[PDB]
Amino acid sequence: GQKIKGTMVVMQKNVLDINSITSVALDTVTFLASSISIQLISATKADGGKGKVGKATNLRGKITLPTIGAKEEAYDAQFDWDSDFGIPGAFYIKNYMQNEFYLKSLILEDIPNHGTIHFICNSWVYNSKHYKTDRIFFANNTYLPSETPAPLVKYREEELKNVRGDGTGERKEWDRIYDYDVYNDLGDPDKGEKYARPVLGGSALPYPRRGRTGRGKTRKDPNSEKPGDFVYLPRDEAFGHLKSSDFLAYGIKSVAQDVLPVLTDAFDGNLLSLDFDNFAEVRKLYEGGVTLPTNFLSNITPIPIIKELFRTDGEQFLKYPPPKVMQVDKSAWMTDEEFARETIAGLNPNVIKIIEEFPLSSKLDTQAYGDHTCIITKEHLEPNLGGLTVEQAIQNKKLFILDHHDYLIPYLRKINANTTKTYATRTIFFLKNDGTLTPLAIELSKPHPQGEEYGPVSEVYVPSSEGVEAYIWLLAKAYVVVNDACYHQIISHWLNTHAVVEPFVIATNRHLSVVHPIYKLLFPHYRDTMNINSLARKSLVNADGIIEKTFLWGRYSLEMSAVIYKDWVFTDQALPNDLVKRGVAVKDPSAPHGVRLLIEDYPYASDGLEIWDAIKSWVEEYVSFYYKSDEELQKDPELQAWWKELVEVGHGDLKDKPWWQKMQTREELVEASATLIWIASALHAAVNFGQYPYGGLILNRPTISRRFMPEKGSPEYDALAKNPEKEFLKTITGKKETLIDLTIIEILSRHASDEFYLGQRDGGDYWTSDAGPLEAFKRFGKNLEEIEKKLIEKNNDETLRNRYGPAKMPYTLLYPSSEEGLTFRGIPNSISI
Ligand SMILES: [Fe+3]
Numbered sequence: 001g002q003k004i005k006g007t008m009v010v011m012q013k014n015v016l017d018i019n020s021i022t023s024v025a026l027d028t029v030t031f032l033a034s035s036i037s038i039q040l041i042s043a044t045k046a047d048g049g050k051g052k053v054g055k056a057t058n059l060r061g062k063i064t065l066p067t068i069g070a071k072e073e074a075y076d077a078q079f080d081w082d083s084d085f086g087i088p089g090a091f092y093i094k095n096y097m098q099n100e101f102y103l104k105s106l107i108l109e110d111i112p113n114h115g116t117i118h119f120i121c122n123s124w125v126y127n128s129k130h131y132k133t134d135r136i137f138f139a140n141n142t143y144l145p146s147e148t149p150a151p152l153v154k155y156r157e158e159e160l161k162n163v164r165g166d167g168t169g170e171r172k173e174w175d176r177i178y179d180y181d182v183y184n185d186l187g188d189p190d191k192g193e194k195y196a197r198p199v200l201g202g203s204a205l206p207y208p209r210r211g212r213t214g215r216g217k218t219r220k221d222p223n224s225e226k227p228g229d230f231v232y233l234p235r236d237e238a239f240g241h242l243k244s245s246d247f248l249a250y251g252i253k254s255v256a257q258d259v260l261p262v263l264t265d266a267f268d269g270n271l272l273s274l275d276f277d278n279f280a281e282v283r284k285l286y287e288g289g290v291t292l293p294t295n296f297l298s299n300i301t302p303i304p305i306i307k308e309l310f311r312t313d314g315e316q317f318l319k320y321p322p323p324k325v326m327q328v329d330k331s332a333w334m335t336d337e338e339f340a341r342e343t344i345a346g347l348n349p350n351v352i353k354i355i356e357e358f359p360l361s362s363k364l365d366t367q368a369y370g371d372h373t374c375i376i377t378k379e380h381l382e383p384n385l386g387g388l389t390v391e392q393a394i395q396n397k398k399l400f401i402l403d404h405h406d407y408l409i410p411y412l413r414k415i416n417a418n419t420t421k422t423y424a425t426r427t428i429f430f431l432k433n434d435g436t437l438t439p440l441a442i443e444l445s446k447p448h449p450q451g452e453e454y455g456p457v458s459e460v461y462v463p464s465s466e467g468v469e470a471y472i473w474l475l476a477k478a479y480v481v482v483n484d485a486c487y488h489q490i491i492s493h494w495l496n497t498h499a500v501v502e503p504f505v506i507a508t509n510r511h512l513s514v515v516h517p518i519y520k521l522l523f524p525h526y527r528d529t530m531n532i533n534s535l536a537r538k539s540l541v542n543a544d545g546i547i548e549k550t551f552l553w554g555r556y557s558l559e560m561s562a563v564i565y566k567d568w569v570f571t572d573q574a575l576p577n578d579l580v581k582r583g584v585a586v587k588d589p590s591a592p593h594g595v596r597l598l599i600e601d602y603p604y605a606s607d608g609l610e611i612w613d614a615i616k617s618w619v620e621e622y623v624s625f626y627y628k629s630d631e632e633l634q635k636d637p638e639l640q641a642w643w644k645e646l647v648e649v650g651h652g653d654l655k656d657k658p659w660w661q662k663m664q665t666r667e668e669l670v671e672a673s674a675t676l677i678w679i680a681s682a683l684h685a686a687v688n689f690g691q692y693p694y695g696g697l698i699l700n701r702p703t704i705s706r707r708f709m710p711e712k713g714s715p716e717y718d719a720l721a722k723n724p725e726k727e728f729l730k731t732i733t734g735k736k737e738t739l740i741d742l743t744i745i746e747i748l749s750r751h752a753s754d755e756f757y758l759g760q761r762d763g764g765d766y767w768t769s770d771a772g773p774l775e776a777f778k779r780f781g782k783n784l785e786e787i788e789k790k791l792i793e794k795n796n797d798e799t800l801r802n803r804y805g806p807a808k809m810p811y812t813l814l815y816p817s818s819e820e821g822l823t824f825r826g827i828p829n830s831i832s833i
Pocket residue numbers: 493498684688831832833
């Protein structure tokens with residue numbers, strides 16, 4: 001059997017690059033007798049206990065397959081083999097070109113007595129000289145460890161060592177070394193000792209690990225990593241995009257680095273007035289944009305990813321879309337039904353919980369802070385429409401808190417010590433008999449000037465519809481949104497999804513071979529996570545980044561994630577566990593998902609549960625194809641090393657916590673897997689894709705509070721009485737930070753046209769050999785089609801008002817699919833923004 005037809009498909013560097021090529025470039029084109037060489041490794045025949053490798057073969061072709069793909073080149077080789085080489089199930093490759101190419105696949109056809117073999121690569125191959133060992137790629141055969149080809153056990157073992165790479169050295173672009181390190185690269189201690197931030201990782205501050213980058217330490221701090229112009233992530237975790245509009249992390253680097261300078265100059269040099277006057281000025285943002293004169297612009301130029309990214313037509317511009325929560329009822333945002341609806345069906349839809357006892361305690365110590373008990377008590381909780389006692393309403397599963405109190409208090413002196421004036425809130429909600437919630441009171445806690453020990457200085461507030469007191473209710477509500485928007489951005493979003501998924505991406509690539517059942521299960525749920533977190537570490541959660549300067553906890557934000565993380569339990573992220581812990585549901589096996597929801601028209605948890613079991617059934621089906629027993633899941637060395645390093649290093653600051661699955665069990669594997677995918681896919685989508693639709697109007701979702709509350713016939717109070725729009729505007733997020741906020745969260749809410757949503761979407765039809773899982777993944781994808789149909793139904797039911805509101809905004813967030821753009825819908829597989 002003479003020649004086996006290999007035919008390789010690839011994408012060139014200039015095609016997945018934001019700048020490279022013209023027309024005629026860095027298009028790298030005429031390939032022949034060396035440019036690329038391939039050796040075939042044997043699955044069947046050995047030399048020792050290692051498959052035969054067979055003769056460097058040049059890529060003697062270059063034309064059409066003819067359905068190759070958009071901007072994909074395909075090569076061809078005729079490999080001279082026989083039979084005593086055996087069947088190939090792996091290959092080594094060498095790039096002799098200057099440029100790297102994106103290798104997609106290699107199909108091995110016309111192999112005698114055997115079928116056409118598939119290699120799914122989706123990896124870049126840089127020049128041969130960058131590598132000690134040449135690139136190895138296995139065929140699409142899923143193999144548990146004690147299921148490897150005996151010529152291939154040593155290449156599989158060898159390949160996982162090279163991805164692991166020792167814990168030394170400064171990492172390069174072309175590398176694929178997954179290793180961990182603490183968050184010690186957020187500060188810039190050398191260019192001022194005020195930009196120095198603490199390490200998030202270890203004894204003192206618990207946190208997950210980030211990808212190791214190995215740059216040099218700082219001059220002033222030997223235990224903190226210097227900044228870099230390039231932040232490293234394992235090469236294949238940074239995805240290119242065939243289209244320029246889809247480099248959204250690049251458009252967010254370019255906000256932080258490029259747009260922000262211009263704004264800083266325009267405000268400073270007064271090309272722009274520093275603060276908004278009416279609420280009609282704020283709405284014009286979305287009606288005509290941020291304008292600036294020709295001469296200023298033609299000098300401070302260009303930043304072209306803010307292209308038809310913001311579609312800034314002509315000139316004298318920057319441009320925002322009208323947010324959905326303002327598209328149809330412009331003032332819907334003021335209404336207490338929209339204020340409370342958004343707790344259940346908004347931007348940050350999972351903080352709220354049941355009230356178990358009353359008064360309402362403080363879980364912080366009295367010798368150091370005091371009596372931080374809630375002063376929302378009994379009197380003001382019995383209103384217009386509220387026949388029950390507080391004691392009947394908790395009895396009846398009708399009274400709810402939004403506690404933004406105790407995590408805030410130790411950090412509040414510190415938060416308020418400069419340009420930001422704020423409270424540590426608490427907010428009681430009543431589930432009205434109509435299925436909707438409403439606010440019954442807000443205690444605003446202020447620090448207390450005679451020390452932390454005689455604090456707080458609390459003030460309760462209740463609904464109002466009269467004169468000036470209307471606006472005091474509004475400002476009381478904004479001091480709660482302010483508290484929540486930064487609990488969102490940081491905890492519900494950065495820590496709970498982005499930050500805690502990183503150790504999973506790293507632990508899977510280091511201990512679970514690219515050929516493993518479970519590597520391939522998890523794998524599509526990691527798409528661009530390491531890339532958006534490396535740019536978040538460089539341009540968003542850094543000393544003076546967009547998150548500190550735009551959101552309330554400021555310089556203390558990420559230090560606060562570490563302490564809130566002291567309480568992060570992985571088990572409770574699973575959506576049943578979550579609901580059951582907050583008390584907005586109970587385990588009722590008679591009920592549809594095995595849980596009865598106490599707030600029954602809670603749109604996030606209602607659609608959520610539908611998507612949770614859709615994920616959990618598939619990973620259970622999948623896992624069953626590969627483990628017929630708990631005792632053979634235990635018998636897997638890679639999997640047990642995956643979970644061992646994950647819980648011990650990855651999230652090692654909680655490594656001795658009692659809730660960690662110990663992976664002795666197939667159901668332990670199934671919930672561990674499903675929780676992860678939930679976090680990566682649906683949770684993240686729930687808390688992220690509704691950021692510009694809801695918080696794209698600072699009125700509706702204010703990020704910073706600059707003044708405190710007007711008291712009683714105060715000059716502040718009479719100024720608010722005179723014109724209340726302006727004093728409100730003076731309390732919340734002022735213009736400059738409104739603009740940087742808005743530009744980030746708009747990009748952050750966009751779906752790239754090349755996005756991979758849950759279902760149907762992985763990389764290739766032949767990502768595995770196994771026919772069972774392939775068809776079990778089309779059924780899971782059909783299942784989501786069906787579930788979307790049930791969700792589309794609940795948004796035509798005009799009975800469920802919580803999924804519409806004063807805002808008239810059908811809660812489209814957990815709809816598993818979507819078109820590109822800034823839809824209020826779609827569930828990607830992963831944290832891709
Ligand atoms: Fe995100």
